[PDB]
Amino acid sequence: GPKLLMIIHDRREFAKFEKEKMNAKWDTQENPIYKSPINN
Amino acid sequence: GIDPFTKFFYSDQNVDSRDPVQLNLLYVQARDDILNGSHPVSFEKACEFGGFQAQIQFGPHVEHKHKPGFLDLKEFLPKEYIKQRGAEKRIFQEHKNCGEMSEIEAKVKYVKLARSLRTYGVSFFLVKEKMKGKNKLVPRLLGITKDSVMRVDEKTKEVLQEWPLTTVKRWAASPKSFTLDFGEYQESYYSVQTTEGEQISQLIAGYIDIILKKKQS
């Protein structure tokens, strides 16, 4: 039915994203204004 | 020869009734941002703004003239609310609430209302995040401010969550996602699907830099 195919599609879309996001590149090793909870 | 003191008065650090030209610029900027969605607002607030807008463009409410059908709604609301039930009736009730206030008073109050929202001055991106308890992506508004990052409900515009920029350890983007690492403030990363990850990263860096240069001076 319409709901069955949608579910399948949605779960694939989620799985694709979970995998792709691991390809992200960090834009800095650390934020200059980051304060540890004990310092802020 | 005339009396300045017969007029509506209000002044705070953002806006001032005694400077008409500056006020109009502030009004135009705020109204445009709301009408075009750059400043996302709830349905209720949209109609409040609309009501001030009507007072500004038409003058005091005339009940037998200003009735459903009179307005070009798309001129007065964010597109999201044009087709919503009773929009116009709500706008006109707010218009009526304005009574005989002047154009300048209405503009001051419009700008004040805009500045009163937590969403004021925030750059929002429409993204998708994981739905609670479901393997499914759903829409959400991700906002970047001068000192924070916030998650906002795309329908109601409720601020769901806010993290100070000082709690952000690092961030990353790929051509299809964006991710925030809050280091010691919480266990898990926050990742969303979006093709605008690069823009988001730059705003965050840009704003952090403005803050890092305040410390210096």
Record the resolution, in angstroms.
Answer: 2.2
**CA–CA separation, B191 vs B22, rounded Å?**
41
Asked if residue B15 belongs to a domain, the reply is: no
Given the structure tokens 């051509």, which residue do they identify? Answer: B175
**Contact call for A10 and B178, based on CB within 8 A:** no
Q: Are residues B42 and B126 in the same domain?
A: no
| Other Cβ atoms within 10 Å of B48 Cβ, number | 20
| CA nearest neighbour of B171 among B145, B142, B198, B194 | B198
- Residue spans per domain, chain A: 1-40
Query: Which member of A26, A33, A37 has the closest CB to residue B170?
Result: A26
d(CA B41, CA B122): 12
Residues B211 and B171 in one domain: yes
Answer yes or no: are the C-beta atoms of B16 and B115 closer than 8 Å: no
Tokens representing residue B201 in the block: 């990263």
Q: What is the CATH number of the domain that holds B155?
A: 2.30.29.30
Same domain (yes/no): B33, B49: yes
Which residues in chain A have their CB less than 8 angstroms from residue B174's CB? Answer: 20-21, 23-25
Q: Do B166 and A28 touch (CB under 8 A)?
A: no
By CA distance, what is A26's nearest residue in B? B172
Closest CA to B100 of B59, B44, B138: B59
Q: Which residue has the tokens 């969403």?
A: B119
User: Rounded distance, CA B169 to CA B198, Å?
Assistant: 17
- SS3 assignment, position B160: strand
Q: What is the DSSP code (8-state) at residue B9?
A: -
The encoded tokens of residue B186 equal 């919480």
Give the CATH number of the domain where residue B99 resides.
1.20.80.10
Boundaries of domain holding B174: 120-217
Is there a contact between B159 and B119 (Cβ–Cβ < 8 Å)? Answer: yes
**Looking at the partner chain, which of A20, A33, A34 has a beta carbon nearest the beta carbon of B176?**
A20
Cα of B185 to nearest chain A Cα, Å: 7
Which amino acid is present at A12?
R
